[PDB]
Design a binder for this molecule. Structure first.
Ligand SMILES: CCCCCCCCCCCCCCCCCC(=O)OC[C@H](COP(=O)([O-])OCC[N+](C)(C)C)OC(=O)CCCCCCCCCCCCCCCCC
Ligand SMILES: CCCCCCCCCCCCCCCCCC(=O)OC[C@H](COP(=O)([O-])OCC[N+](C)(C)C)OC(=O)CCCCCCCCCCCCCCCCC
Ligand SMILES: CCCCCCCCCCCCCCCCCC(=O)OC[C@H](COP(=O)(O)OCCN)OC(=O)CCCCCCCCCCCCCCCCC
Ligand SMILES: CCCCCCCCCCCCCCCCCC(=O)OC[C@H](COP(=O)(O)OCCN)OC(=O)CCCCCCCCCCCCCCCCC
Ligand SMILES: CCCCCCCCCCCCCCCCCC(=O)OC[C@H](COP(=O)(O)OCCN)OC(=O)CCCCCCCCCCCCCCCCC
Ligand SMILES: CCCCCCCCCCCCCCCCCC(=O)OC[C@H](COP(=O)(O)OCCN)OC(=O)CCCCCCCCCCCCCCCCC
Ligand SMILES: CCCCCCCCCCCCCCCCCC(=O)OC[C@H](COP(=O)(O)OCCN)OC(=O)CCCCCCCCCCCCCCCCC
Ligand SMILES: CCCCCCCCCCCCCCCCCC(=O)OC[C@H](COP(=O)(O)OCCN)OC(=O)CCCCCCCCCCCCCCCCC
Ligand SMILES: CCCCCCCCCCCCCCCCCC(=O)OC[C@H](COP(=O)(O)OCCN)OC(=O)CCCCCCCCCCCCCCCCC
Ligand SMILES: Nc1nc2c(ncn2[C@H]2C[C@H](O)[C@@H](COP(=O)(O)OP(=O)(O)OP(=O)(O)O)O2)c(=O)[nH]1
Lengths: 368, 173, 341, 167, 48, 96, 66, 100, 117, 49
């Protein structure tokens, strides 16, 4: 909110950030370390969304730099198909059965009708969900606000747009809603959301500017498909989130300047809504007592594994998402014997890790 | 003697109390009975100190539940039951008749009133409630009182946590 | 003890409340401890995020209030006629005290409230209810010496506890009916001794302490979720579910040793007919445990494929794996235990 | 009114036996009937509620009487009080069960369930053992039950001596 | 021989509860004569 | 009998208290109303027994302290009832 | 500071606690003074108290003037 | 009185709750009886304390005397309603108020 | 007592007679459909008075029940000061009033004493 | 406070000179009553089984 010019200098944290990447924050940690002491005017969450290929990433980086905000790059399937040691899981796909073959954005743009599309869309929701929670931990433990490109709240638009084009089936949409309902309610909605309304014709021109191989060659980015996204952002997402978060709309800040945009944000006031307790605007982040602050911090810092275990919703009547038992055995063999997947990250000796005899530590909010 | 008539009334008010439906009808019935039970208890005791306390304690509970009755069950109905009025009035006079023709030396409770005590009982010539309430604040039973204190204070922490004041008022939405 | 400093207090005051009851040398003192225990559990049990949880906070309150109320009623009546905390020869006035205590613990004839309040509890709440809340009630029943009333509850407990459980799919509701059966074994073990009961209770709590964590750590609430649950090594998932067999009291595992010592003493006391009805009815209890193992013993399943990864808490899992290890290999340590001789 | 079934030999005191068995027939009938009218059937009106009490209790009285009569009749007719008598008795009550449930098979099979039940009861009476005997061993402590005490308050002096009294 | 005797011995203890091993419930009268002490202490203090 | 001439009346009153605590009334408050009715009768008997002792009536305070807390706690749970269901009617709760 | 803020915001709790603190102090003087006089043995006794000349209590009779 | 199994220090808290040892007509009667319970233990005490329990119960519960009293009153009324007494001489001379 | 009850009844009879005189001594006129209508500043009323009246001091309302039941335990103090052990009486009493104050100040600082907002 | 205590003790001291007097009177009449009751009991219930 207070840019570097307003403060005249870099952000001055109220107190030292808690090392949330390395130390857990359970109940007994909360007794000695309090949460509210670190919150500033800039302790907020910003979602910089827009249509496809609207230069959100460039705008976010510049924006997050002015407001001294942490910038979180948009999720991609490389986070699933590239392990920590850097090995590419996709190289293993010749071995795997066809149903378990790797699927990415490239594939979606090239064979959008494949049954793995329903899988692919749920993964994006799951990835955004985990990343979104990671931002909250950074906010609550460091007090520095975060800038996100696309929140999990906005992800159902792509699933809905894909459904209208007929790529998905009725079942896949039914499954997606149950996951979203089962999980979405546990997040804190963003303080501010910024939208970059590029008209439909413009984005179609803009996509060809990137000159990405598969996108230009693809057929998915049709007028109908791209039009569906526009109708979904404005009619369903933006109309809903504005009840909680401040909403700014620009034709394209990616093509425009950000210094004007930062000066637009700082004009927006975030305290007028604080007066009424039950006011919907920014309701989620209204904690009366210090206990409520710590509870939210504990939930995301210490109970994220619970948050990521709600995605277990059993639905087998849908045939697309089900993975056959015979494939699962084969897939388990190949997947978990790949270099670096034998053990948890940081223990695979064959990948060069050393000292395992005297090593006993595991990461926090780490897998396995 | 009035002890038997107190027996009749407490019975009578209890019969109707089983048949009340309206919460305030229940409350009025209960309030009337709290008077009688308070009166009756002091008959069979060396003092009425506890009737005063009991009366005072319950009246606190009487007000509070009206506040919630008037917020939750405000719109409800009464129905005069001619079966009930006759039945209670029928037995009430019937019971009152017995108390006049009762061997009411036999019906009196054996618990020793202050006057029922002997004249030699040296411990009965002190203040009205000195000894009885004494060891509430002497070793070792005093710790029980102390235990209540935490129990009451710990209770005071329970209500605020169950209540969650900050999330709004109470309305019968 | 999961969210705030306040939850830490309520847990401790629960311990104090239970201790006051089982250390009290009179009925009235015992009754006070129950009241202390009552309000220590409700705030732990009530959470407004769930429409179901507040309903659970109700059914428990109305039941427990009635139980303590009737319990105090009889205790006053008991020493109005005997003038002692103890009755020389047991009679109806002592039966009434027993009836309240059984309802306080949800034994068979008055168990109805107990499963019907398990819909809206977190797993950690169910453990406190299933294990700890049954200490104070059952421990006072050791004082009363009525046979037929206690005997009737056992026979109905194992029956109702088993047959009811076949029809459930909610694990929280299933465990309730499972717990009612193990409750039946306690009361049977309680008419013969307590040291068996103290031993048997400790093992019962141990197994339930384990199964609760596995559901609690992976937030499973329905049978279908077990099949959809993802685990890296199907060998690992296969072994975790081998705790249910111990909860079924199969001899190769630790969970039979408790059942075993309860038979070596019931038989020693000539209660042969009881054991027939009990042990036979335990099979039905053993049945729906296997229905859970359908998701583990077969070990290649059709599972949803939008998960490749297990996200689990370390410390709970760290303590859960240790507890599970003994739950499968704990038998050879019977040599060490010297509390049965 | 309080008659015990085995107060006399098997072929004796018919009126004494019928009262004894009908006692348990009524008690079990009412006990189950209370659950039936509140928890399962839930009839409405003061009259039909009695039908559930009669329906669940009535035939259950017929069973007990049938067993006593058939068991008593068999005891005299055959000339010996042996296990087959109680087996013969059980099939009678089973027959009444079918008439109650309008089911030919239910009565037949339930007779066998009841038939073997009676046989074992006679086994107990004739061999001299009990179904729910009073516990001979009742343990009220561990080994150190009189030693393990943790209380802090000093116990003031004693007032009784184990030593032989002085005079 | 030892487990048919030891079993027999336990039955006699349970039949009459006349030993402080397993079948004996310690009935403590300590607290009451603490109360009697406290009453005596308070008897002296009475007066002004 | 002694118990009939002296202790019958409070016991008969007590059971009538329970039969209020179980009867079908729409509002949850009907349970709370009958709750402290029973407590009032429990006090009455307990006060009979405590007076058979010459000086032990002080324990009446101990009982009253727990009486209010169960009523006070009983009232708090009702408040939490309202702010999840919106109303306290028994028929509004899931039958399980 | 702290003292100033309260003394400006809630002066009664400061003054009230000032006298409350007075209670604990002069309660600590009186209680210690009570056992500095052996006040358990009170010269005037409720009821008719009579001792035998040989009873241990008969030695502890507090001997006063009026 | 009951015997807690636990007998941790908490029992000290609630042990002296209700007693007869504070200025009671039955203080000595109970001390003997309950002492005998301590000497013989609880279960065996119930079989050796026949006199002490009965005396103590007839000192507090007083059923044995109240249940004499009604026999006298009822037998006084039965005589009159049978005509064996008269209205003029129904009761005996009352005691003096300054007595008992 | 028994004296007080008699005068309690006698007063109640007397006060009862007062309106029973007023009900007759009162001028009598035909009651109108509007005369008996409620008073709400001369305009017909929108809302029955028996609608749910929202509450904001509910939390204090419960705390009131508690704080009274500790008044049951302070009142006996005076009566048993001449008769009790001074250490036990002194110590316990203080840690009774400190507990109360600490409870009060704790909630006051937590803001529970403030009304719903 | 001194003067109130002064007066109270004087009132209490007057009891201790009167209290022995009454106890002497009550005993000599308490006993006399017991004989009458032991005699009324005999006459009342001559014919009881
Ligand atoms: C006006 C409010 C001013 C800001 C908050 C108080 C600042 C002064 C600190 C006083 C000490 C802490 C008081 C407090 O917050 O309650 C205990 C809070 C929680 O309050 P609580 O609402 O969860 O209830 C606490 C219940 N007991 C007391 C049983 C634990 O924190 C703790 O309990 C432990 C940390 C204490 C030190 C925190 C500083
Ligand atoms: C819960 C806590 C409640 C605490 C308040 C208790 C008293 C509230 C009673 C309110 C009136 C109840 C009622 O409507 O009954 C009507 C009853 C008649 O019942 P009814 O059923 O015939 O009324 C309906 C009439 N029809 C059928 C025509 C619609 O009338 C009365 O006699 C009530 C007399 C109340 C007297 C005033 C009480 C003041 C007490 C002051 C303190 C004690 C001194
Ligand atoms: C088909 C369904 C029905 C199955 C059979 C049910 C009837 C089981 C028998 C009734 C219950 C137990 C009877 C019993 O107590 O047997 C005791 C008998 C007498 O031995 P004793 O120890 O000397 O007696 C006490 C001193 N007089 O001595 C003994 O019998 C002790 C030896 C063990 C007895 C175990 C009997 C239970 C067998 C259950 C089988 C269950 C069906 C399995 C198929
Ligand atoms: C484990 C389950 C075991 C259940 C049954 C155990 C009892 C075994 C039967 C014992 C027995 O004695 O059976 C034979 C008995 C014949 O004996 P009796 O009645 O005297 O008639 C013929 C001689 N006059 O006749 C009977 O007792 C009837 C046996 C019927 C068994 C049906 C199964
Ligand atoms: C199979 C279902 C059987 C239900 C139980 C049958 C039964 O109640 O039998 C016992 C009963 C009483 O028999 P009894 O040993 O004399 O004990 C009376 C103590 N008051 O009734 C009897 O008298 C036993 C008569 C034989 C019943 C055989 C039933 C098969
Ligand atoms: C088709 C279904 C029709 C409907 C159901 C009909 C049955 C209804 C029965 C209702 C009445 C049940 C209640 C009966 C109470 C009888 C007394 C009791 O409580 O049980 C004890 C009884 C005898 O007591 P016991 O310990 O053996 O000591 C000797 C006493 N004279 O113990 C006994 O006598 C036991 C008798 C049964 C033993 C069966 C053992 C064999 C089981 C084979 C299967
Ligand atoms: C001539 C006849 C005249 C008759 C006059 C009668 C008047 C009757 C009407 C009085 C009511 C007036 C209105 C009222 O109620 O005021 C109460 C008073 C106002 O103060 P308050 O509202 O709290 O201040 C603002 C709070 N935000 O509330 C208060 O704050 C008063 C609190 C009083 C606290 C007194 C503490 C005294 C402490 C004594 C010791 C002080 C010395 C220093 C410490 C010594 C330590 C040893
Ligand atoms: C029709 C039923 C008729 C029966 C009468 C019902 C009305 C009751 C009115 C009398 C209430 C006052 C009372 O009885 O007090 C009794 C008791 C006095 O005890 P004590 O301290 O010794 O003082 C005696 C002084 N002579 O002190 C107490 O017990 C406490 C009394 C509290 C009284 C509250 C006022 C109630 C007013 C009547 C409401 C109706
Ligand atoms: C010397 C003791 C120093 C105590 C310092 C207290 C200074 C300020 C007190 C105050 O009232 O400031 C406002 C503060 C905010 O608390 P709040 O949640 O808004 O509740 C209403 C408060 N009037 O109010 C509070 O939080 C606390 C108010 C009560 C504090 C009393 C402490 C007395 C200790 C002796
Ligand atoms: N099916 C599907 N595709 C998505 C989703 N989110 C992003 N994409 C795909 C759509 C396009 O093929 C492609 C567009 O990438 P982006 O719009 O995110 O651009 P990028 O973040 O790389 O940089 P920029 O937006 O220009 O700042 O990714 C989704 O939720 N579902």
């Amino acid at each position: 909110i207070s840019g570097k010019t307003m403060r005249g200098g870099p952000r001055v944290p109220k107190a030292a950030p808690y090392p949330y990447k390395t130390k857990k924050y359970s109940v007994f940690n909360a007794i000695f370390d309090k949460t509210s002491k670190r919150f500033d005017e800039n302790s907020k969450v910003i979602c910089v969304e827009g249509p496809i290929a609207a230069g959100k990433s460039k705008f976010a980086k510049e924006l997050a730099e002015e407001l001294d905000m942490e910038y979180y790059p948009a999720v991609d399937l490389d986070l699933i198909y590239i392990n920590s040691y850097g090995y590419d899981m996709r190289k293993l796909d010749p071995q795997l059965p066809p149903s378990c073959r790797s699927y990415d954005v490239r594939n979606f743009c090239l064979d959008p009708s494949h049954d793995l599309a329903a899988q692919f869309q749920i993964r994006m929701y799951m990835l955004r969900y985990s990343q979104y929670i990671d931002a909250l931990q950074h906010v609550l433990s460091t007090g520095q606000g975060v800038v996100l490109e696309r929140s999990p709240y906005s992800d159902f638009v792509f699933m809905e747009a894909m459904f209208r084009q007929g790529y998905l089936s009725r079942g896949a949409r039914s499954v997606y809603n149950e996951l979203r309902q089962n999980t979405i309610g546990e997040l804190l909605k963003p303080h501010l959301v910024i939208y970059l309304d590029l008209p439909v014709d413009a984005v179609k021109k803009q996509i060809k500017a990137r000159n990405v191989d598969y996108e230009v060659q693809s057929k998915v980015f049709s007028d109908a498909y791209l039009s569906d996204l526009e109708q979904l952002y404005k009619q369903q997402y933006l109309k809903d989130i504005s009840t909680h978060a401040e909403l700014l709309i620009y034709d394209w800040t990616a093509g425009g300047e950000t210094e004007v945009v930062v000066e637009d944000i700082e004009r927006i006031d975030f305290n007028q809504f604080e007066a009424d307790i039950h006011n919907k605007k920014m309701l989620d982040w209204r904690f009366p007592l210090e206990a409520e602050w710590c509870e939210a911090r504990i939930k995301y810092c210490h109970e994220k594994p619970d948050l990521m275990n709600y995605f277990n919703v059993p639905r087998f009547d849908v045939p697309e998402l089900v993975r056959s038992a015979d494939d699962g055995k084969v897939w388990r063999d190949v997947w978990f014997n790949a270099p670096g997947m034998k053990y948890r990250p940081g223990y695979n000796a064959d990948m060069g890790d050393e000292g395992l005899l005297t090593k006993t530590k595991i990461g926090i909010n780490q897998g396995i | 003697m009035i002890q038997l008539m107190l027996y009749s009334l407490i019975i009578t008010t209890s019969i109707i109390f089983l048949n009340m439906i309206h919460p305030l009808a229940l409350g009025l019935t209960l309030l009337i009975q709290t008077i009688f039970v308070c009166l009756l208890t002091g008959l069979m005791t060396k003092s009425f100190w506890y009737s005063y306390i009991l009366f005072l304690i319950f009246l606190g509970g009487m007000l509070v539940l009206f506040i919630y009755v008037t917020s939750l069950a405000s719109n409800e109905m009464f129905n005069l039951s001619m079966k009930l009025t006759l039945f209670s009035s029928l037995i009430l006079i019937f019971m009152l008749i017995l108390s006049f023709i009762m061997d009411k030396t036999s019906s009196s409770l054996f618990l020793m009133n202050n006057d029922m005590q002997s004249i030699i009982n040296m411990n009965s010539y002190f203040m009205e409630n000195s000894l009885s309430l004494n060891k509430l604040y002497n070793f070792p039973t005093n710790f029980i009182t102390i235990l209540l204190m935490n129990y009451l204070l710990i209770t005071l922490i329970v209500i605020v946590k169950i209540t969650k004041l900050f999330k709004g008022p109470i309305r019968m939405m | 003890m999961f969210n705030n400093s306040s939850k830490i207090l309520f847990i401790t005051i629960m311990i104090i409340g239970t201790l006051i009851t089982v250390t009290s040398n009179s009925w009235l003192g015992a009754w006070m401890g129950l009241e202390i225990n009552l309000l220590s559990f409700i705030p732990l049990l009530s959470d407004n995020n769930n429409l179901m949880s507040t309903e659970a906070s109700l059914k428990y309150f109305l039941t427990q209030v009635l139980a303590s109320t009737v319990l105090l009623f009889s205790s006053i009546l008991l020493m109005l006629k005997n003038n002692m905390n103890n009755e020389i020869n047991e009679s109806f006035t002592s039966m009434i005290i027993m009836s309240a205590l059984l309802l306080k613990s949800g034994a068979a004839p008055f168990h109805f409230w107990f499963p019907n309040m398990m819909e809206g509890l977190t797993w950690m709440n169910a453990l406190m209810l299933m294990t700890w809340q049954k200490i104070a009630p059952l421990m006072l029943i050791s004082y009363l010496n009525i046979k037929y009333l206690l005997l009737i509850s056992v026979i109905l407990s194992v029956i109702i506890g088993a047959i009811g459980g076949l029809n459930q799919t909610s694990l929280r509701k299933l465990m309730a009916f499972s717990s009612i059966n193990h409750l039946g074994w306690m009361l049977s073990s309680l008419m013969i001794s307590e040291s068996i009961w103290l031993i048997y209770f400790f093992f019962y709590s141990f197994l339930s302490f384990v199964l609760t964590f596995m559901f609690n750590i992976f937030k499973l609430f329905h049978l279908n979720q077990l099949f959809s649950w993802f685990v890296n090594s199907k060998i690992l998932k296969f072994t975790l579910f081998m705790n249910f067999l111990s909860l079924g009291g199969l001899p190769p595992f630790l969970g039979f040793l408790p059942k075993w010592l309860v038979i070596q003493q019931l038989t020693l006391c000539n209660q042969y007919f009881m054991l027939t009805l009990m042990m036979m009815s335990t099979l039905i209890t053993l049945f729906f445990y296997l229905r859970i193992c359908y998701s583990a013993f077969m070990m290649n399943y059709f599972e949803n494929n939008w998960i490749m990864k297990m996200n689990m808490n370390s410390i709970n899992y760290n303590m859960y794996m240790i507890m599970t290890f003994f739950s499968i290999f704990g038998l050879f340590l019977i040599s060490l235990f010297y509390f049965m001789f | 009114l309080r008659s015990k079934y085995y107060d006399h030999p098997d072929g004796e005191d018919a009126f004494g036996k019928i009262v004894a068995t009908n006692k348990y027939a009524v008690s079990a009938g009412v006990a189950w009937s209370m659950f039936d009218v509140l928890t399962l059937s839930k009839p409405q009106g003061y009259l039909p509620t009695l039908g559930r009490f009669a329906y669940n209790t009535g035939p259950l009285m017929g069973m007990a009487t049938a067993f006593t009569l058939t068991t008593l009749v068999a005891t005299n007719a055959r000339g010996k009080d042996d296990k087959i008598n109680y087996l013969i008795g059980g099939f009678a009550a089973g027959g009444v069960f079918g008439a109650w449930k309008h089911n030919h098979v239910a009565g037949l099979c339930a007779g066998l369930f009841l038939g073997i039940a009676g046989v074992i009861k006679k086994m107990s009476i004739e061999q001299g053992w009990e179904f729910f005997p009073n516990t001979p061993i009742k343990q009220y402590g561990g080994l150190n039950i009189a030693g393990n005490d943790w209380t802090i308050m000093a116990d003031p002096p004693k007032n009784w001596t184990t030593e032989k009294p002085k005079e | 021989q030892i487990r048919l005797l030891e079993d027999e011995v336990r039955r006699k203890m349970s039949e009459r509860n006349d030993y402080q091993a397993y079948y004996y419930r310690p009935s403590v009268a300590k607290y009451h004569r603490i109360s009697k002490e406290a009453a005596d202490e308070l008897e002296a203090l009475r007066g002004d | 009998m002694i118990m009939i001439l002296y202790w019958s009346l409070p016991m008969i009153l007590f059971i009538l208290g329970l039969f209020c605590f179980v009867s079908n009334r729409k509002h949850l408050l009907s349970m709370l109303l009958s709750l402290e009715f029973i407590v009032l009768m429990l006090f009455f008997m307990l006060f009979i027994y405590l007076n058979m002792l010459n000086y032990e009536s002080y324990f009446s305070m101990m009982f009253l302290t727990f009486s209010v807390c169960e009523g006070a706690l009983g009232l708090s749970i009702l408040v939490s009832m309202i702010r999840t269901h919106g109303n306290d009617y028994f028929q509004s709760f899931s039958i399980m | 500071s702290l003292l100033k803020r309260a003394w400006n915001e809630i002066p009664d709790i400061v003054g009230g606690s000032a006298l409350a603190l007075a209670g604990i102090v002069m309660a600590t003087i009186g209680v210690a003074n009570y056992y500095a006089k052996d006040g358990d043995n009170r010269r005037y006794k409720l009821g008719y108290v009579v001792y035998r000349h040989d009873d241990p209590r008969a030695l502890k009779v507090r001997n006063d003037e009026d | 009185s009951l015997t807690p199994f636990l007998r941790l220090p908490l029992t000290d808290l609630t042990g002296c709750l209700i007693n007869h040892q504070t200025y009671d007509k039955c203080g000595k009667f109970e001390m003997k009886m309950m002492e005998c319970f301590e000497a013989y233990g609880l279960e065996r005490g119930k079989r050796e304390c026949a006199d002490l329990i009965s005396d103590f119960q007839e000192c507090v519960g007083m059923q044995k005397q109240l249940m004499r009293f009604h026999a006298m009153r009822n037998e006084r009324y039965k005589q009159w309603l049978k005509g064996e007494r008269k209205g003029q001489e129904f009761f005996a001379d009352p005691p003096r108020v300054d007595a008992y | 007592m028994f004296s007080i009850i008699f005068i309690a009844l006698l007063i109640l009879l007397i006060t009862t007679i007062v309106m029973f005189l007023a009900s007759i001594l009162s001028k009598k006129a035909l009651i109108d459909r509007e005369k008996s209508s409620p008073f709400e500043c001369g305009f017909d009323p929108k809302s029955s008075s028996r609608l749910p009246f929202s509450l904001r001091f509910f939390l204090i309302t419960i705390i009131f029940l508690i704080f009274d039941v500790e008044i049951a335990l302070i009142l006996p103090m005076i009566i048993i000061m001449k008769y009790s052990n001074i250490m036990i009486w002194t110590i316990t009493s203080i840690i009774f009033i400190l507990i109360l104050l600490i409870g009060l100040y704790h909630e006051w600082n937590q803001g529970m004493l403030n009304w719903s907002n | 406070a001194k003067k109130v205590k002064r007066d109270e003790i004087e009132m209490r001291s007057a009891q201790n000179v009167i209290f022995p007097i009454l106890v002497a009177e009550r005993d000599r009449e308490f006993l006399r009553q017991l004989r009458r009751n032991r005699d009324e009991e005999a006459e009342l219930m001559k014919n009881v089984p």
